[PDB]
Amino acid sequence: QTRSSRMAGFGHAVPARCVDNAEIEASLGLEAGWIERRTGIRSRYWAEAGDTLSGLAERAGRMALEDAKINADDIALTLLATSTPDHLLPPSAPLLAHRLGLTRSGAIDLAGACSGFLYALTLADGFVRTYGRAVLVAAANILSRRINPAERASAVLFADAAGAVVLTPCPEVKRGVLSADLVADGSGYDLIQIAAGGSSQPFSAGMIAEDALMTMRDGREVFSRAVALMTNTSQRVLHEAELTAADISRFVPHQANARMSDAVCGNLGIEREKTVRTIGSFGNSSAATIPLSLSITNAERPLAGGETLLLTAAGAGMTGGAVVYRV
Amino acid sequence: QTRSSRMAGFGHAVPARCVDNAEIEASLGLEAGWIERRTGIRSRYWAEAGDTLSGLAERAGRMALEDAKINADDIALTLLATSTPDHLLPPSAPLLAHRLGLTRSGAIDLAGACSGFLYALTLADGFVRTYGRAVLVAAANILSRRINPAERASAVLFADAAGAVVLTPCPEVKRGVLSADLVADGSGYDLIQIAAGGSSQPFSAGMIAEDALMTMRDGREVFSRAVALMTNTSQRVLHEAELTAADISRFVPHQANARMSDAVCGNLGIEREKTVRTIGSFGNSSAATIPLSLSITNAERPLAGGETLLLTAAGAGMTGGAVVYRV
C-alpha cells in the first residue's frame, strides 16, 4: 500500500552554552576574526556538565513528533545517528525511545560519522516503504567533549546539536526519496581517527585523554576528499532522479565549514541562495548538521508540495552520501 | 521488480586462539565443569594481540561473498553490526568494504548490542527491496577485550566471532523476510553497561580500569527480560506471518547461554532439535551469534527452498527482535 515516505515532522535542539569565536580564539592564541574568516562559524553551542547526548536527542525528537502531530504508538522504529553515545554500551537509541514514550518502537544507533544521518534516512525510508510504518530518524552529537586542543580544526569547528525527522508512510509515487547514493572509501580511513578506546587499542591505565581525542593527518586532504564525495554522490542522485541542479529548491549539505559548502554548491552549479547554511550559528555537529538544518529551514519557510531537496554529506571513513527528496 | 530478498551467501570467522572452559575455570578459581554446567559453553575463540575487528569481519564477509558467488560491483551497501569497532572514529564498516574490494558499496556501522544483526538484517532487506541492489550484512565483535574477570557471567560467556550474509534482490513474492518485529525497552538501560568512554563519562587519565569494561547489575533480571523480549517478538512475527511454531524448520536464537535458548524454545513450543546451537563451540559473541549460526547450519545442511527460519535476539538497552525468513 505504501509507496513513499513523507518527512512529516522536524525538530532540533542545542545545549544552553553559546560559545562565541572570541572565547576560543583567546584559548588558542588566535587573532580576532580568525575563526569566522576561515570556517564561516560565528558561534556554536556546547554541552554543560551533566548534559547527556540522549537528553539532547530527546528534545529534538520530541519537537519532531509534536511537529508531525503523530501518535506515539505509530513510531515503529527509532534510529539514532551518533558518534558520541552516552555509553559505549548499551546504545543510546533505546533510552531515547523510552524517554519519548515510544513504547512500540524498536531502536538502534548508527555510527557513520558525519554521513550518519543520510544513511539513517535512506535506511528508514526503506523501512517505511517496506512495512508501512513510521520511523523517527534522529542524529545527535556532543563533539565538544571530543575536542582536541592540539587539533585546531576540532577546537574551532566542533559543536553540539541534535536534529530529528519523523518519516511517515505515504501512498503516492514519484515523491519522497527519489534517489539515494551511499558510498564509502576506506582508503581514507586513517585521515581522521581517534587512536584509543576501540578494540584496536582499548583505553588502559597509563593513557592520556588525548589518545581518546580526534586526530587529523591532513586537513586539506580531508577537505578535497569530502568535496569530491559530496559532489560525486550529488551528481549521481540528480542523474538518477532525472533532474538538474536547476530543479533543486533547497540544497542542504553537511555543515563542515562554509568553504566546503561553497565548493560543492559551485561544483554542482547550484545557486548559492538555495543553500541552507546553519554553520554560522550552529557550528559543525557532525551527523546532526543536516536534520538541524532541515528543522531550521522548515521553520523559516515550511516545505511546500513539489519542492525538491538535495541532501549530501561526507564523513570520516571515509563515507559519503546524497539523497534527493521531493516534497 | 524486486519483491523480496534472498540470503545468497553465508560466512563466518573466528580468531585463532581456542579457549576451553578449563583455562577460564582455572583463571577464575572455579571447580571443573562449572562453566558448561551453568552456560552450555564448552569452548570459545578469543582474539590475539594484533587481531582487528575489521580483519575478523573481513574473513566472514569474504566467505559469504564467495558463497554467494557475487560480483563485487553488485554490493551497494555494507552494514556492520558491532559493539567493538577498531576505533571510536571512524566506523569500521568503510574499512571492511575497502578491504573486500566492494568499490561500489556504501558502509555504516550499527550499534544494537546483541540485537544488532536482526536490526541490520531488517534494514538491509528494506534497502534490497527499495533499490533492487544487494547488501553485505556483517556482524562482528571482539568481546574478549571487554571482559571484566570480576563480572563472572561476562568472563565465562563472552567470545570473539564474525558472521555475514549476502542479501540479494529477488523478484518473487511470498518469500524472504515474511515478518520482522523490532522492539526496545529502555527501562532496562542500566542493567548492562560500560560506565566510561561514552559521552557521559569520557575516557580520561586515571580512570578505573573496570570503568571501561562491561558491568551487569542483575543477571537474573537480564535473563528474564531477554527471554520475554525474544518470546514476545517471536510470537509476533509468527502471527504476522500466519505461521505456527510447527511451521518453523530452523530456530536460530541469539546464543546467550543454553538455558536462555531452551527457555525461549520451550515458551514458543518449538521442537528442541530444530534449534540451531552454536554456543557450545563458539560462545556468546553478541551480534555475531545469529549470522555465525546461519553459516554453520547452512554448511551442515544447505538451506532448502520452502524452509522457514525464525531468528530472534535480545540485547543491552534493552532491545529485541525477531525475523521470519522463508527460503
Numbering used by the authors:
A (entry chain A), B (entry chain B): 2 to 328
Copy text verbatim from the article accompanying this structure deposition.
In contrast, a fabH-like gene, bioZ, seems to be domesticated into a unique bioBFDAZ operon in certain α-proteobacterial species. Genetic and biochemical characterization demonstrates that BioZ catalyzes the condensation of glutaryl-CoA (or ACP) with malonyl-ACP to give 5’-keto-pimeloyl ACP. This intermediate proceeds via type II fatty acid synthesis (FAS II) pathway, to initiate the formation of pimeloyl-ACP, a precursor of biotin synthesis. Thus, we proposed a working model that the α-proteobacterial BioZ enzyme behaves as an atypical member of β-ketoacyl-ACP synthase III to synthesize C7-fatty acyl moiety, bypassing the canonical ‘BioC-BioH’ earlier steps of pimelate generation.
Using X-ray crystallography, we crystallized and solved the structure of AtBioZ at a 1.99 Å resolution. The dimeric nature of the AtBioZ protein belongs to the space group of P 21 21 21 and contains two protomers in per asymmetric unit (ASU), of which the refinement statistics are listed in Table 1. The lid domain of AtBioZ contains four α-helices and two β-sheets, which is covering on the ‘α/β/α/β/α’ core domain. The core domain of AtBioZ features a triple decked sandwich that is formed by nine β-sheets and ten α-helices. In brief, the β-sheets of β1 and β4–β7 are sandwiched between the helices α3–α5 and α6, together with helices of α13–α14 to form the first layer, while the sheets of β8–β11 are sandwiched between the helices of α9–α12 and α6, together with the helix of α13–α14 to form the other layer of the “sandwich”. Interestingly, a putative catalytic triad (C115, H255, and N285) is centered in the core domain of AtBioZ. Structural alignment revealed that the root-mean-square deviation (rmsd) of Cα atoms of AtBioZ is 2.8, 2.7 , and 1.2 Å, in comparison with FabB, FabF, and FabH, respectively, while the rmsd between FabB and FabF is 1.4 Å. The diameter of substrate entrance of both AtBioZ and FabH is measured to be around 5 Å. The depth of the substrate-loading tunnel in AtBioZ is 20 Å, quite longer than the counterpart (15 Å) of FabB. Unlike that the FabB substrate-binding pocket whose entrance is close to the dimeric interface, the entrance of the AtBioZ substrate-binding pocket is relatively far away from the dimeric interface. Similarly, the surface around the entrance of BioZ pocket is enriched with positively-charged amino acids, namely Arg39, Arg153, Arg221, and Arg260. In particular, we localize that three residues (S84, R147, and S287) at the distant bottom of the tunnel might neutralize the charge of free C-carboxyl group of the primer glutaryl-CoA.
